[PDB]
């Protein structure tokens, strides 16, 4: 995952 | 006629605000329709699909946001946050669009106002699942859930400690626990008569699961009909 | 004597009995094994299928006798009785087999005593869905459900008002209500310690519907891999 | 057009 990681780590 | 349930009402309020602020209520949107293939059903309407897949991407983003609003969710490891999201995502995508159903017009409204009729939902990418999803929408009406109950439900669904490949499943169970008692109570307060509503509403998650299961298979079939590739976020959630 | 208390103890008893007398307990079964494709995992063991499909068919028959024992079930329409059976048949097949699971040997036991391990189960026809079915069996032991809980839970699957193409959804729906109440009352009678055990047990139906959805998709895959037709009754229930 | 389930229902 590239997106979920970003979106979650904020 | 009740009692104090303090730090559970405060939690309940957190869930309602988290939901509303990430999911515009139906009555509060600027509806607009479309003329594309509204007449007859087709395999897939590239036009309708384009906007639909974009609104799907966006709704997923709002879902992730709704998650980070749920107390403790951010406290879980990144791997468990992802595991929980990937398992409940489609279940909530379903839940949301179904709470946007207009019984008389037989339509559904997205968060940009876009309002499609049953046949257009079919052509947007619902295929064989159209009648099934729409049946679920009609089954929700008679319950008259509000944004609080809908938010609480979506939360119970996401925060489920029975998911596979989960590292701290009891940490998850603990988080879910109050969301259950929170719902149990709120329904009792919101309704002083019909007392068999907690179960009836609660196991609507059961209904979501069936549709979400058959839903994943639809998502597989769709990649076989699509101009190019699935929105990266959608693939990321369905693996 | 309080009325609803009395009526629910009645319902609870009729269903427990209707379960015991239509489904033997793992403890009262004389087990026995077989060596057919027991060590390695293959596409399909025609020998195991035949025997599995025979025992499943007889379980279906058993399940049908169970329904007929449910208060009000033969009060529905025949389309509806038929419809309910076809839509819950696989749910209960799963539930029933998963309560016949033995952890130490990693095996499941049919009604004639037959005891197949995880590999043989796969070779029997479970295929790629095997581990999913076993995992669910593991997440069932900690609940240590009994004849009454397993029975009521099966009746709830069977008496579901949200099933499609029902002639009288509302009647079927009001018919499910007493069951949901009996389960709650009983679950609390048994474990007045763990208070949140009602929604936990109840929501195992979420797992059922998911496995069942995939089971139906699996059955269709078997339908082309088997050098012959499945037993006639299974055919019908899977239509 | 199977005829089993019905026969089972009827008893
Ligand atoms: O407020 C919005 O704008 C909104 C609300 C719900 C959604 N819901 C979905 O995208 C959705 C709802 C139900 C579905 C049922 C089966 C399959 C999909 C699906 C998901 C991803 C790609 C293709 C199909 C489904 C997708 C999208 C946007
Ligand atoms: O005690 C018995 O005699 C007994 C108990 C449970 C079963 N369960 C099933 O036959 C069963 C259980 C789980 C299943 C999961 C996915 C697919 C099937 C299935 C059903 C019919 C034909 C092929 C596969 C499944 C079938 C059968 C016999």
Residue numbers in the entry:
A (entry chain C): 630 to 639
B (entry chain B), C (entry chain A): 170 to 408
D (entry chain G): 629 to 639
What did the study's authors say about this model?
These structures revealed that RAR LBDs exhibit a common fold comprising 12 α-helices (H1-H12) and a short β-turn (s1-s2) arranged in three layers to form an antiparallel “α-helical sandwich”. Another key component of the LBD is the C-terminal helix (H12) which is repositioned upon agonist binding to complete a hydrophobic surface with residues from helices H3 and H4 that is specifically recognized by the LxxLL motifs (also called NR boxes) of CoAs. To gain structural insights into the specific binding and activity profiles of the newly characterized synthetic ligands, we solved the crystal structures of RARβ LBD in complex with BMS411, BMS641 and BMS948.
Importantly, the novel compound BMS948 acted as a full RARβ-agonist at 1 μM, whereas a very weak activity was seen with RARα and RARγ. In contrast with BMS641, BMS948 harbors an amide linker. This flipping by 180° of the amide bond induces a change in the position of the rings B and C of BMS948 and BMS411 as compared to that of Am580 and BMS614 in RARα. Interestingly, the only difference between BMS411, which retains a significant interaction capacity with RARα, and the RARβ-selective BMS948 resides in the replacement of a dimethyl-cyclohexenyl ring by a planar phenyl group. Indeed, in the absence of the two methyl groups, the carbon atom at position 5 of the BMS948 naphthalene ring remains involved in several contacts with RARβ LBP residues whereas no interaction distance below 4.6 Å is observed in RARα. Thus the divergent binding modes of BMS948 in the two receptor subtypes bring the naphthalene ring into a LBP environment that is more sensitive to the loss of the methyl groups in RARα than in RARβ, in full agreement with the much higher affinity of BMS948 for RARβ. A superposition of the BMS948-bound RARβ LBD structure with that of RARγ bound to the selective ligand BMS961 shows that, as in the case of BMS641, the position of BMS948 is incompatible with the presence of Met272 in RARγ.
